[PDB]
Design an enzyme around this catalytic site. Structure first.
Site, PDB file in Angstrom:
ATOM      1  CD  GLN A  70     -20.444 -26.130  -1.060  1.00 25.89           C
ATOM      2  OE1 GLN A  70     -20.285 -26.501  -2.828  1.00 25.89           O
ATOM      3  NE2 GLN A  70     -20.748 -25.690  -0.673  1.00 25.89           N
ATOM      4  CE1 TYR A 101     -36.602 -77.561  -1.419  1.00 25.47           C
ATOM      5  CE2 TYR A 101     -37.549 -74.987  -1.564  1.00 25.47           C
ATOM      6  CZ  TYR A 101     -37.557 -76.208  -1.894  1.00 25.47           C
ATOM      7  OH  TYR A 101     -38.698 -76.761  -1.736  1.00 25.47           O
ATOM      8  N   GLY A 125     -41.415 -77.287 -11.179  1.00 27.38           N
ATOM      9  CA  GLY A 125     -41.060 -75.905 -10.838  1.00 27.38           C
ATOM     10  C   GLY A 125     -39.766 -76.258 -11.103  1.00 27.38           C
ATOM     11  CG  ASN A 153     -36.928 -72.758 -11.997  1.00 18.84           C
ATOM     12  OD1 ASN A 153     -36.760 -73.303 -12.409  1.00 18.84           O
ATOM     13  ND2 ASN A 153     -38.514 -72.244 -11.223  1.00 18.84           N
TER      14      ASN A 153
HETATM   15  C1  F43 Z   1     -47.082 -77.086   3.186  1.00 20.28           C
HETATM   16  C2  F43 Z   1     -47.459 -76.715   1.185  1.00 20.28           C
HETATM   17  C3  F43 Z   1     -48.057 -76.126   1.393  1.00 20.28           C
HETATM   18  C4  F43 Z   1     -47.946 -74.715  -0.446  1.00 20.28           C
HETATM   19  O1  F43 Z   1     -48.162 -74.625  -0.581  1.00 20.28           O
HETATM   20  N1  F43 Z   1     -46.522 -74.902  -0.292  1.00 20.28           N
HETATM   21  C5  F43 Z   1     -45.852 -75.664   1.167  1.00 20.28           C
HETATM   22  C6  F43 Z   1     -45.135 -74.619   2.218  1.00 20.28           C
HETATM   23  C7  F43 Z   1     -44.727 -73.666   1.057  1.00 20.28           C
HETATM   24  C8  F43 Z   1     -44.236 -72.103   2.541  1.00 20.28           C
HETATM   25  C9  F43 Z   1     -44.017 -73.606   3.683  1.00 20.28           C
HETATM   26  C10 F43 Z   1     -44.009 -71.849   4.665  1.00 20.28           C
HETATM   27  C11 F43 Z   1     -46.035 -71.794   5.411  1.00 20.28           C
HETATM   28  O2  F43 Z   1     -46.256 -71.529   6.348  1.00 20.28           O
HETATM   29  O3  F43 Z   1     -46.449 -72.700   4.793  1.00 20.28           O
HETATM   30  C12 F43 Z   1     -42.801 -71.997   1.145  1.00 20.28           C
HETATM   31  C13 F43 Z   1     -41.925 -71.264   2.458  1.00 20.28           C
HETATM   32  C14 F43 Z   1     -43.131 -71.286   0.430  1.00 20.28           C
HETATM   33  C15 F43 Z   1     -42.295 -70.289  -0.339  1.00 20.28           C
HETATM   34  N2  F43 Z   1     -42.208 -68.923   0.026  1.00 20.28           N
HETATM   35  O4  F43 Z   1     -41.414 -70.791  -0.874  1.00 20.28           O
HETATM   36  C16 F43 Z   1     -42.465 -73.733   0.764  1.00 20.28           C
HETATM   37  N3  F43 Z   1     -43.393 -74.380   0.849  1.00 20.28           N
HETATM   38 NI1  F43 Z   1     -42.875 -76.362   0.579  1.00 20.28          NI
HETATM   39  N4  F43 Z   1     -40.900 -75.903   1.482  1.00 20.28           N
HETATM   40  C17 F43 Z   1     -40.026 -77.068   1.105  1.00 20.28           C
HETATM   41  C18 F43 Z   1     -39.795 -78.564   0.956  1.00 20.28           C
HETATM   42  C19 F43 Z   1     -41.135 -78.707   0.549  1.00 20.28           C
HETATM   43  C20 F43 Z   1     -40.954 -80.454  -0.046  1.00 20.28           C
HETATM   44  C21 F43 Z   1     -41.229 -81.088   1.208  1.00 20.28           C
HETATM   45  C22 F43 Z   1     -41.132 -83.126   1.181  1.00 20.28           C
HETATM   46  C23 F43 Z   1     -41.758 -83.878   2.334  1.00 20.28           C
HETATM   47  O5  F43 Z   1     -42.322 -85.297   1.446  1.00 20.28           O
HETATM   48  O6  F43 Z   1     -42.011 -83.377   3.466  1.00 20.28           O
HETATM   49  C24 F43 Z   1     -41.956 -80.240  -0.444  1.00 20.28           C
HETATM   50  C25 F43 Z   1     -42.328 -80.373  -2.567  1.00 20.28           C
HETATM   51  C26 F43 Z   1     -41.567 -81.795  -2.745  1.00 20.28           C
HETATM   52  O7  F43 Z   1     -43.493 -82.072  -2.819  1.00 20.28           O
HETATM   53  O8  F43 Z   1     -41.283 -81.701  -3.451  1.00 20.28           O
HETATM   54  C27 F43 Z   1     -42.864 -78.812  -0.183  1.00 20.28           C
HETATM   55  C28 F43 Z   1     -44.505 -78.833  -0.229  1.00 20.28           C
HETATM   56  C29 F43 Z   1     -45.304 -78.101   0.755  1.00 20.28           C
HETATM   57  N5  F43 Z   1     -44.795 -76.192   0.285  1.00 20.28           N
HETATM   58  C30 F43 Z   1     -47.023 -78.200   0.067  1.00 20.28           C
HETATM   59  C31 F43 Z   1     -47.006 -79.035   0.867  1.00 20.28           C
HETATM   60  C32 F43 Z   1     -48.404 -79.579   0.998  1.00 20.28           C
HETATM   61  C33 F43 Z   1     -49.445 -79.118   0.027  1.00 20.28           C
HETATM   62  O9  F43 Z   1     -49.930 -80.299  -1.061  1.00 20.28           O
HETATM   63  O10 F43 Z   1     -50.175 -77.955  -0.162  1.00 20.28           O
HETATM   64  N6  F43 Z   1     -41.770 -78.019   0.425  1.00 20.28           N
HETATM   65  C34 F43 Z   1     -38.699 -79.202   1.383  1.00 20.28           C
HETATM   66  O11 F43 Z   1     -38.305 -80.004   0.263  1.00 20.28           O
HETATM   67  C35 F43 Z   1     -37.268 -78.416   1.837  1.00 20.28           C
HETATM   68  C36 F43 Z   1     -37.472 -77.197   1.452  1.00 20.28           C
HETATM   69  C37 F43 Z   1     -38.840 -76.258   2.106  1.00 20.28           C
HETATM   70  C38 F43 Z   1     -39.225 -75.021   1.900  1.00 20.28           C
HETATM   71  C39 F43 Z   1     -38.114 -73.933   2.845  1.00 20.28           C
HETATM   72  C40 F43 Z   1     -37.111 -73.987   3.375  1.00 20.28           C
HETATM   73  O12 F43 Z   1     -36.183 -73.629   2.523  1.00 20.28           O
HETATM   74  O13 F43 Z   1     -35.917 -73.962   4.171  1.00 20.28           O
HETATM   75  C41 F43 Z   1     -40.550 -74.881   1.669  1.00 20.28           C
HETATM   76  C42 F43 Z   1     -40.559 -74.093   0.888  1.00 20.28           C
HETATM   77  C1  F43 Z   2     -16.079 -28.872  -5.621  1.00 16.44           C
HETATM   78  C2  F43 Z   2     -18.231 -28.216  -6.280  1.00 16.44           C
HETATM   79  C3  F43 Z   2     -18.354 -28.829  -7.180  1.00 16.44           C
HETATM   80  C4  F43 Z   2     -18.734 -29.864  -7.530  1.00 16.44           C
HETATM   81  O1  F43 Z   2     -19.721 -31.085  -8.328  1.00 16.44           O
HETATM   82  N1  F43 Z   2     -19.480 -29.915  -5.984  1.00 16.44           N
HETATM   83  C5  F43 Z   2     -19.512 -28.526  -5.155  1.00 16.44           C
HETATM   84  C6  F43 Z   2     -18.659 -29.743  -4.147  1.00 16.44           C
HETATM   85  C7  F43 Z   2     -20.015 -30.447  -3.468  1.00 16.44           C
HETATM   86  C8  F43 Z   2     -19.677 -32.030  -2.555  1.00 16.44           C
HETATM   87  C9  F43 Z   2     -19.039 -31.434  -1.061  1.00 16.44           C
HETATM   88  C10 F43 Z   2     -17.646 -31.551  -0.615  1.00 16.44           C
HETATM   89  C11 F43 Z   2     -16.912 -30.907   0.384  1.00 16.44           C
HETATM   90  O2  F43 Z   2     -17.893 -31.127   1.432  1.00 16.44           O
HETATM   91  O3  F43 Z   2     -16.150 -30.784   0.159  1.00 16.44           O
HETATM   92  C12 F43 Z   2     -20.742 -31.935  -2.537  1.00 16.44           C
HETATM   93  C13 F43 Z   2     -21.465 -32.515  -0.940  1.00 16.44           C
HETATM   94  C14 F43 Z   2     -21.590 -33.387  -2.968  1.00 16.44           C
HETATM   95  C15 F43 Z   2     -20.928 -34.337  -2.552  1.00 16.44           C
HETATM   96  N2  F43 Z   2     -22.041 -35.262  -2.791  1.00 16.44           N
HETATM   97  O4  F43 Z   2     -19.312 -34.724  -2.691  1.00 16.44           O
HETATM   98  C16 F43 Z   2     -21.943 -30.565  -2.626  1.00 16.44           C
HETATM   99  N3  F43 Z   2     -20.907 -29.171  -3.363  1.00 16.44           N
HETATM  100 NI1  F43 Z   2     -21.332 -28.237  -4.014  1.00 16.44          NI
HETATM  101  N4  F43 Z   2     -22.708 -28.028  -1.985  1.00 16.44           N
HETATM  102  C17 F43 Z   2     -23.552 -27.350  -1.307  1.00 16.44           C
HETATM  103  C18 F43 Z   2     -23.366 -25.752  -2.051  1.00 16.44           C
HETATM  104  C19 F43 Z   2     -22.748 -25.448  -2.799  1.00 16.44           C
HETATM  105  C20 F43 Z   2     -22.825 -23.533  -3.721  1.00 16.44           C
HETATM  106  C21 F43 Z   2     -22.344 -22.870  -2.074  1.00 16.44           C
HETATM  107  C22 F43 Z   2     -23.060 -21.438  -2.638  1.00 16.44           C
HETATM  108  C23 F43 Z   2     -21.483 -20.190  -2.317  1.00 16.44           C
HETATM  109  O5  F43 Z   2     -21.412 -19.728  -0.893  1.00 16.44           O
HETATM  110  O6  F43 Z   2     -20.970 -20.223  -2.699  1.00 16.44           O
HETATM  111  C24 F43 Z   2     -21.573 -23.548  -4.813  1.00 16.44           C
HETATM  112  C25 F43 Z   2     -22.285 -23.250  -6.019  1.00 16.44           C
HETATM  113  C26 F43 Z   2     -22.227 -22.030  -6.633  1.00 16.44           C
HETATM  114  O7  F43 Z   2     -21.458 -22.164  -7.605  1.00 16.44           O
HETATM  115  O8  F43 Z   2     -23.135 -21.102  -6.033  1.00 16.44           O
HETATM  116  C27 F43 Z   2     -21.890 -25.254  -5.036  1.00 16.44           C
HETATM  117  C28 F43 Z   2     -20.586 -25.610  -5.115  1.00 16.44           C
HETATM  118  C29 F43 Z   2     -19.673 -26.840  -5.431  1.00 16.44           C
HETATM  119  N5  F43 Z   2     -19.616 -27.794  -5.060  1.00 16.44           N
HETATM  120  C30 F43 Z   2     -18.488 -26.502  -6.346  1.00 16.44           C
HETATM  121  C31 F43 Z   2     -17.616 -25.557  -5.750  1.00 16.44           C
HETATM  122  C32 F43 Z   2     -17.164 -25.401  -4.544  1.00 16.44           C
HETATM  123  C33 F43 Z   2     -16.126 -24.431  -4.230  1.00 16.44           C
HETATM  124  O9  F43 Z   2     -16.392 -23.623  -2.869  1.00 16.44           O
HETATM  125  O10 F43 Z   2     -14.627 -24.461  -4.609  1.00 16.44           O
HETATM  126  N6  F43 Z   2     -22.195 -25.963  -3.840  1.00 16.44           N
HETATM  127  C34 F43 Z   2     -25.035 -24.858  -1.353  1.00 16.44           C
HETATM  128  O11 F43 Z   2     -25.542 -23.985  -1.626  1.00 16.44           O
HETATM  129  C35 F43 Z   2     -25.250 -25.446   0.241  1.00 16.44           C
HETATM  130  C36 F43 Z   2     -25.368 -26.727  -0.186  1.00 16.44           C
HETATM  131  C37 F43 Z   2     -24.338 -26.690   0.052  1.00 16.44           C
HETATM  132  C38 F43 Z   2     -24.338 -29.054  -0.383  1.00 16.44           C
HETATM  133  C39 F43 Z   2     -24.064 -29.298   0.833  1.00 16.44           C
HETATM  134  C40 F43 Z   2     -25.612 -29.602   2.066  1.00 16.44           C
HETATM  135  O12 F43 Z   2     -26.679 -28.956   1.783  1.00 16.44           O
HETATM  136  O13 F43 Z   2     -25.206 -29.226   2.813  1.00 16.44           O
HETATM  137  C41 F43 Z   2     -22.944 -29.130  -1.326  1.00 16.44           C
HETATM  138  C42 F43 Z   2     -22.826 -30.117  -1.678  1.00 16.44           C
END
Ligand code: F43
Ligand code: F43
Ligand SMILES: C[C@@H](OP(=O)(O)O)[C@H](NC(=O)/C=C/CCCCSSCCS(=O)(=O)O)C(=O)O
Ligand SMILES: O=S(=O)(O)CCS
Lengths: 114, 550, 47, 194, 495
Positions: free
Chosen positions: E93, E278, E390, E426
């Site tokens: 092409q 974790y 959970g 989980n």
């Molecule tokens: C601070 C929170 C508030 C909440 O809604 N979830 C938190 C915080 C949340 C945020 C922390 C970011 C932030 O800005 O809050 C995220 C990232 C939630 C998420 N997208 O997965 C997280 N915890 Ni939590 N959380 C973790 C953990 C834990 C452990 C901490 C144990 C301890 O006694 O210190 C316990 C869960 C449990 O009781 O078993 C825990 C609790 C809690 N976790 C409770 C505790 C306070 C609450 O009552 O509101 N995390 C961990 O056990 C380690 C992994 C860690 C996760 C992030 C990481 O993997 O890097 C994070 C995972």
């Molecule tokens: C081999 C195929 C069969 C197929 O599934 N796709 C081909 C080839 C394929 C390849 C080109 C590979 C390379 O660069 O060598 C790709 C890029 C698709 C891909 N992702 O691989 C493509 N065509 Ni086609 N293909 C195009 C076009 C066209 C127009 C060309 C018009 C003409 O002058 O005859 C004709 C369709 C027709 O039957 O008229 C065409 C055919 C064909 N197209 C016929 C036969 C080509 C031949 O010359 O032997 N492309 C175009 O019309 C312009 C846009 C252009 C696409 C790439 C871009 O946008 O730059 C490209 C899009």
């Protein structure tokens, strides 16, 4: 980024490569820089760090922060040249012309890096 | 003759757009394109460094690319050009962020939660308490853990795009709330649109949660709702201190994060098994409401064409060419609907014809007006293709041509009548007229839904009937084939742009996506795609702070 | 700026009416309706 | 350029691969000019935003002590409806160790309602000017709304004997502070110290 | 004297670094969060983006319908083609756009075969060599299971699964396979045989990491909720590099915790903080290692590695002994108790050790889960607490469901997964279930648990994540020295 250090000291090369990497990571500058080459000359105290950025003033400020981080503390006299490739020479002595020539050579080498 | 697509054809093609002849096989193959050469240099460096000699990119196998002149692509209503490779959704960060912003959005209503807090839980709810809750949820939504240093939290720089916003149709509550995290309907919309949206919404309060992009990158789209619900529950039980039992807390939890939740998309059944907030579950009206050009433009054609561009980039590129097919993708088909002003010219002609003949909304939807408007627009588009050979070279595939002409016809019919199903009927008539005109259509299975369409446009059967606003990628006829769905969304929008409506299907989605804090600004999707194709789009979801620099 | 006027804090926009001016430590201070002192340079008149 | 000697803490750090500081410990920098107060020895506070400020001040030529609070995480018990999750506090010995310094630099977090009440409890016993280094944009008036002495926005009924002398925003916990923030902090310290 | 403004110091243990089991690296608890650890993200990315396609029906179509002859040279040419097409290069092409190779450097198409004669004259660049990667006995077992069949492993780019979901991978691989087939053998671009290729590669010969979950669960294929426990056991490659059965089971436990409990449960089915403490409870300190080694020592002292056939009495004996020992250890050492402060952590660790011991005694995975559930309900009576409420939903119905034969309740533990009705909600169970399933086979010295193709596919040395030592890679990611794919910095502006 690409990191390479030109030093004849084995331990210094690896350690300062790690320092350059860490300073790039800390400023989050790795993806914004293509190459970062450092030339270590410790016998005559001077170091050169070149930066080739990818493709404002805030980025430049971050780059000078990187130079400040990487460069050894004792090398306090520094001067930089910026023409899309930032190169700085740091030494405890006033900068000589040969060091600047080495800096421009590094700059041109970094420009054609691809 | 003056045409909107003429300037792009002048820029793309060296010869006259009306010239019928050219020369080939003299461009050097893939070397004629800077993108391909950059790809070759990269592939060499990657192979040697990271792949340990396993080849990755070999242009020397397969088709010799570049036997013809690889044209650049304009972007409609934007004066910037880009190569076709920059518009691939994988190479374009703007399209990726367009999908990211839609994926990570959930709207939750907070009026049942407030009522349960006031009455059942015996806790007063005031604008100060609402501000406190907003502060709590803004800290806790990205990765935060409230007053718990021992809990693991996400790096803050990793979720800089995460926000929690609030909006309400109650004016006094709106001005009593903090403006730091409020989506102000009054100052974001024109006066009449704001009044209509407030009347539709009511006196209710809604919160918008933007889950960080990285969460959707690592996980799927069904993670967004669960993340939002969990953070909302934690923030609600942290902000308001409550002395009621745990069962009352369960009732409050239902009221707060399982009652008035609005999702962007629904889950899909069968072989399309997918969770919510995936692009195949987004209805056409919802996507029309996502795009915000009704706010900043009074032109109906521009309003429909922005929705066309967004729907193409989403449905044809991301959804169909990756989620459903994969590979190089279907970028071609989608760019055909928003690159040059071809569809703009066709739609402007359709609007002009309707205004001259029937008036802006001067007729009730009858068969005769559908037939004549669709036929006229289709004939105009096809003769435009005929007399401009450069245009036919630009839209080389039959599908891309058929979709553009049929979209123009459907937009014209929707302008004339204001009914979306009449517009889709005009689309189908345009498709079959195109087939008879050029003895051609799209690819092998392009017109499955275009032969089934006329009968299903106004049907009343269970699996065939739906308003075009309520249809989407899971509509059985539209499930598989490319080159339709974005234009369907554009037609659904045009049904309401003719009436000057403030929204199409959901006011809450419109207000939510009016938010200035979004990375991708939906007011100008085409401009943002142009910016992304130039590598000047700042996307989110990058793990720069957790990766080595080397 | 005088008692009974309407002023807003530039940094946040809090609206209130000036209650009194109570100089202390050779420095002017402005008291608003929320019983909070402010600085005249950080306040400005609105109508 | 003068010699700078630090009284290292008497207790070791947090395990093998952990932090170098310990909770509830003090490291006097002999000549007492600035004390940097860290809420905890954890990665969110120590060596990422705090030792950076420390070496910035020590590079500016100003001796620095670092004090790690015994209970620096949470909100004070005097906060509305009490505290949740954890309780913030300041010990009398910690207050005495702070109060022998010319100035204090304290690093705070994100939530505004937490920062204001933590600063109020801190300044209830600290009588030297302090600098608040936080991430969120907090205005130098919300502290006065709950009674804190503040350089620009004084309260009618002051509940603290300490003066919040400067607020610096944009310093994130656990992340390297850019040189611009360090320069701002150093300039504020220099202009508000001597 | 009571001063209410003194405060309460809290979280001393959480300030200390977390060691990693069987390693020597210390990391912070914040760096083990799945969002902050690029190694865990790359683990999930590598599992998600893997699809195995059997390239035998396609060869038969090419031979009997299209009259094309298939030889090792043609297969080499096809592999060359697909390694260019799968990342997103153009083969036919004219006038296509292509994806940036920098964004798809992790995209590989590999081939492995149980036929030694065909594997001999195959380009070693694209070959996953079973003989080289596996010891002699394990290689023979894997070849006997696979047979004289040829398979292709497609690893689509991580960026694809990050922009899209996990259901994209099979379709991506199928399209690129069809394109490479029609362009490598010079066929018509579209005919009936093309449909035969497409159907084969789309479902007939495809192997998915995870099944789709339509209906209430509402998820596509290749999601962590669809990965069975045996599949995850076969993903981990410690079996081919180590002979310690406890070490293999514990590496599978670590991988299962990091995948299920962290990613799947704390993000896909929950949000925010997630469940890091974790899951890290099972692979940070040697607590689970010490308990498992005690279980193995006890079993080898009174039963042997396979000295007994699975009966109820041996399950009761081993599970009770290991649970009593683990709880006694928690009582004796306050450091262990303050490390596993939450009851769920403790319950999961003790029950995992008991189940691993039962599996090492009997070689049956269902006996292993039965021992796990006995351990849970014995822990409950020992300490008068189990976990968060959970937590023990599945632990209460477990004993009845472990050996059940009813339709909704019966499944071999290798065939169970996060979509098993009891296990669907989980935290603190699933990774240990995967470890028990692996231990059922580590006792017998088996080469694989459920799928030989998955084992061979993940033995590939070009994977970004090293599945031989998952805990080492997790530690490397926690220390910001793990290089992950899927990043898009060549298409982004400088920051
Ligand atoms: C601070 C929170 C508030 C909440 O809604 N979830 C938190 C915080 C949340 C945020 C922390 C970011 C932030 O800005 O809050 C995220 C990232 C939630 C998420 N997208 O997965 C997280 N915890 Ni939590 N959380 C973790 C953990 C834990 C452990 C901490 C144990 C301890 O006694 O210190 C316990 C869960 C449990 O009781 O078993 C825990 C609790 C809690 N976790 C409770 C505790 C306070 C609450 O009552 O509101 N995390 C961990 O056990 C380690 C992994 C860690 C996760 C992030 C990481 O993997 O890097 C994070 C995972
Ligand atoms: C081999 C195929 C069969 C197929 O599934 N796709 C081909 C080839 C394929 C390849 C080109 C590979 C390379 O660069 O060598 C790709 C890029 C698709 C891909 N992702 O691989 C493509 N065509 Ni086609 N293909 C195009 C076009 C066209 C127009 C060309 C018009 C003409 O002058 O005859 C004709 C369709 C027709 O039957 O008229 C065409 C055919 C064909 N197209 C016929 C036969 C080509 C031949 O010359 O032997 N492309 C175009 O019309 C312009 C846009 C252009 C696409 C790439 C871009 O946008 O730059 C490209 C899009
Ligand atoms: C999706 C959801 O289903 P359900 O909530 O409808 O049962 C299901 N969640 C649960 O079953 C329950 C969630 C709570 C998280 C686990 C608690 S760990 S910290 C809380 C300790 S406690 O104080 O709640 O007992 C899940 O799969 O995550
Ligand atoms: O031409 S085909 O209908 O096979 C596909 C077009 S890309």
């Amino acid at each position: 980024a690409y990191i390479d250090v030109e030093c004849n000291d084995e331990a210094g090369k690896a350690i300062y490569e790690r320092i350059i990497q860490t300073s790039l990571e800390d400023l989050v500058l790795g993806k914004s820089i293509i190459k970062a080459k450092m030339i270590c000359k410790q016998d005559v105290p001077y170091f050169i760090i070149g930066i080739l950025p990818k493709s404002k003033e805030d980025f430049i400020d971050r780059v000078l922060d990187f130079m400040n981080r990487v460069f050894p503390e004792g090398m306090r006299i520094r001067k930089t040249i910026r023409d899309k490739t930032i190169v700085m020479v740091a030494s405890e002595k006033p900068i000589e012309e040969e060091w600047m020539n080495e800096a421009v050579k590094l700059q041109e080498e970094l420009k054609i890096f691809k | 003759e003056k045409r909107l697509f003429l300037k792009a054809l002048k820029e793309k093609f060296e010869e006259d757009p009306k010239e019928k002849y050219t020369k080939f096989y003299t461009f050097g193959g893939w070397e004629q394109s800077a993108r391909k050469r950059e790809f070759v240099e990269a592939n060499e460096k990657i192979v040697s460094e990271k792949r340990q000699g396993i080849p990755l990119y070999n242009p020397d196998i397969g088709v010799p690319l570049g036997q013809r002149k690889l044209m650049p692509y304009k972007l409609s209503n934007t004066d910037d050009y880009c190569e076709g490779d920059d518009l691939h959704f994988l190479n374009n960060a703007a399209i990726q962020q367009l999908w990211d912003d839609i994926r990570r959005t959930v709207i939750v209503g907070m009026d049942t939660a407030h009522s349960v807090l006031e009455k059942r839980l015996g806790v007063e709810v005031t604008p100060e308490t609402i501000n406190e809750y907003m502060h709590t949820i803004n800290h806790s939504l990205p990765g935060g853990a409230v007053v718990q240093e021992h809990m693991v939290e996400v790096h803050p720089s990793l979720a800089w795009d995460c926000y929690a916003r609030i909006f309400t149709g109650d004016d006094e509550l709106a001005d009593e709330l903090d403006s730091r995290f409020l989506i102000d309907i009054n100052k974001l919309f024109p006066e009449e649109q704001a009044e209509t949206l407030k009347a539709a919404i009511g006196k209710k309060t809604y919160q918008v949660s933007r889950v960080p992009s990285l969460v959707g990158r690592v996980c799927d789209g069904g993670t967004i709702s669960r993340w939002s619900a969990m953070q909302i529950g934690m923030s609600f039980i942290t902000a308001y201190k409550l002395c009621a039992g745990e069962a009352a807390t369960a009732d409050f939890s239902y009221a707060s994060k399982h009652a008035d939740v609005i999702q962007m998309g629904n889950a899909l059944p069968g072989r399309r098994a997918r969770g919510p907030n995936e692009p195949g579950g987004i209805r056409f009206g919802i996507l029309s409401d996502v795009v915000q050009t009704t706010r900043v433009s009074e032109d109906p054609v521009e309003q429909s064409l922005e929705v066309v561009a967004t729907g193409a980039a989403l449905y044809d590129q991301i959804w169909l060419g990756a989620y459903m097919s994969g590979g190089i993708g279907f970028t071609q088909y989608a760019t055909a609907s928003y690159t040059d002003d071809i569809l703009d010219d066709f739609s402007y002609y359709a609007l002009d014809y309707v205004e001259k003949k029937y008036g802006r909304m001067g007729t009730k939807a009858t068969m005769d007006v559908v037939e004549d408007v669709a036929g006229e627009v289709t004939l105009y588009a096809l003769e435009q293709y005929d007399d401009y050979p450069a245009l036919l070279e630009d839209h080389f595939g039959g599908s891309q041509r058929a979709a553009v002409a049929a979209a123009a016809s459907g937009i014209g019919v929707c302008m004339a009548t204001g009914n979306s199903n009449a517009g889709v009927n005009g689309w189908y008539l345009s498709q079959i007229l195109h087939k008879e005109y050029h003895s051609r259509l799209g690819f092998y299975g392009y017109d499955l839904q275009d032969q089934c369409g006329a009968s299903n446009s106004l049907a009343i059967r269970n699996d065939e009937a739906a308003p075009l606003e309520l249809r989407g990628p899971n509509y059985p006829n539209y499930a598989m084939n490319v080159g339709h769905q974005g234009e369907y969304a554009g037609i659904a929008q045009a049904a309401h742009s003719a009436r000057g409506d403030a929204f199409a299907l959901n006011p809450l989605v419109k207000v939510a996506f009016a938010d200035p804090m979004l990375v991708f600004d939906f007011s100008k999707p085409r401009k943002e795609i142009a910016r992304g194709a130039l590598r000047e789009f700042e996307a989110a979801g990058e793990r720069d702070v957790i990766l080595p620099a080397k | 700026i005088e008692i009974g006027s309407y002023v807003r804090y530039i940094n946040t926009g809090t609206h209130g009416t000036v209650k009194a001016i109570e100089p202390k430590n050779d420095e002017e201070w402005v008291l608003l309706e929320n019983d909070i002192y402010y600085r005249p340079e950080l306040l400005e008149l609105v109508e | 350029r003068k010699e700078q000697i630090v009284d290292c803490r008497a207790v070791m750090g947090l395990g093998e691969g952990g932090g170098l500081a310990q909770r509830g410990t003090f490291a006097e920098g002999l000549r007492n000019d600035v004390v940097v107060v860290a809420m905890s020895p954890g990665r969110r506070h120590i060596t990422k935003p705090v030792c950076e400020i420390t070496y910035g001040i020590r590079e500016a030529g100003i001796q620095t002590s670092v004090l790690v609070l015994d209970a620096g995480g949470g909100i004070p018990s005097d906060a509305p409806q009490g505290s949740l999750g954890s309780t913030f506090g300041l010990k009398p010995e910690e207050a005495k160790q702070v109060n022998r310094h010319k100035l204090c630099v304290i690093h705070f977090g994100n939530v505004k309602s937490h920062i204001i009440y933590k600063a109020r409890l801190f300044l209830k016993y600290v009588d030297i000017p302090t600098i608040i280094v936080c991430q969120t944009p907090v205005d130098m008036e919300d502290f006065a709304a709950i009674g804190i002495k503040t350089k620009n926005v004084m309260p009618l009924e002051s509940k603290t004997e300490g003066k919040i002398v400067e607020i610096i925003t944009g310093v994130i916990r656990g992340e390297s502070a850019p040189q611009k923030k360090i320069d701002e902090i150093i300039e504020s310290i220099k202009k508000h110290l001597g």
